[PDB]
Design a protein around this ligand. Structure first.
Ligand SMILES: CC[C@H](CO)NC(=S)N[C@@H]1C[C@@H]2CC[C@H]1C2
Length: 209
């Protein structure tokens, strides 16, 4: 059972800008998604200090980068707090409306797309390189869900039937045809060293066989 929702008008406007604007510094998407993973890991770690049972769904706190040349997908896995069903459909987009609005006013004032993280909407920079984004997430208080959007003004949410995650978020980027450089090992290493050298959790690059 799949439910289809419409993006909030400001978010759909931002996504259309991100895909259609000519902007060559696309590598900032990985910094934004790693920063998102670091924030999610900070939250579950903070919550576990007063309730250690929140780590029953997994003690390890890490970020995994998994490129797949065959599927042309770059996957970013974290064992953070995860996202509930209300997070995917309503609450996180509601928090993002103001940041989205301010980001586009800035872009009209000559600001750069690379400053998307300062407005707390850095996730949508994934569409700089991805034609479709699939998000598998599991929160301690909810079931495992699958969020997906190829932009165009709509996204889908469904209960995920695949492999159980325990807890965390998996961001699967279905890369555009001309953005396969982010499946290269040495390219991912350069981006992580340049943008994410100060993340307080282990970032592991999965080398393909
Ligand atoms: C980067 C912050 C921004 C705030 O809205 N996005 C987050 S934290 N999550 C989003 C909600 C849906 C599930 C993943 C995306 C789409």
């Amino acid at each position: 059972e799949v439910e289809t929702f419409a993006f909030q008008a400001e978010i759909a406007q931002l996504m259309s800008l991100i895909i259609n604007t000519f902007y060559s510094n696309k590598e900032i998407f990985l910094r934004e998604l790693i920063s998102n993973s670091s924030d999610a890991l900070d939250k579950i770690r903070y919550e576990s200090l007063t309730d250690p049972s929140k780590l029953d769904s997994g003690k390890e706190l890490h970020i995994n980068l998994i490129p797949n040349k065959q599927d042309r997908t770059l996957t970013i896995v974290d064992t953070g707090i995860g996202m509930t069903k209300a997070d995917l459909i309503n609450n996180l987009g509601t928090i993002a409306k103001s940041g989205t609005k301010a980001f586009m006013e800035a872009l009209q004032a000559g600001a750069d797309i690379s400053m998307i993280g300062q407005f707390g909407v850095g996730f949508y920079s994934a569409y700089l390189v991805a034609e479709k984004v699939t998000v598998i997430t599991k929160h301690n208080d909810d079931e495992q869900y699958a969020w997906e959007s190829s932009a165009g003004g709509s996204f889908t949410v469904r209960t995920d039937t695949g492999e159980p995650m325990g807890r965390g978020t998996k961001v699967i980027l279905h890369l555009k045809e001309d953005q396969t450089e982010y499946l290269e090992e040495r390219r991912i290493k350069e981006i992580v060293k340049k943008h994410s050298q100060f993340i307080g959790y282990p970032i592991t690059l999965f080398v393909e066989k």
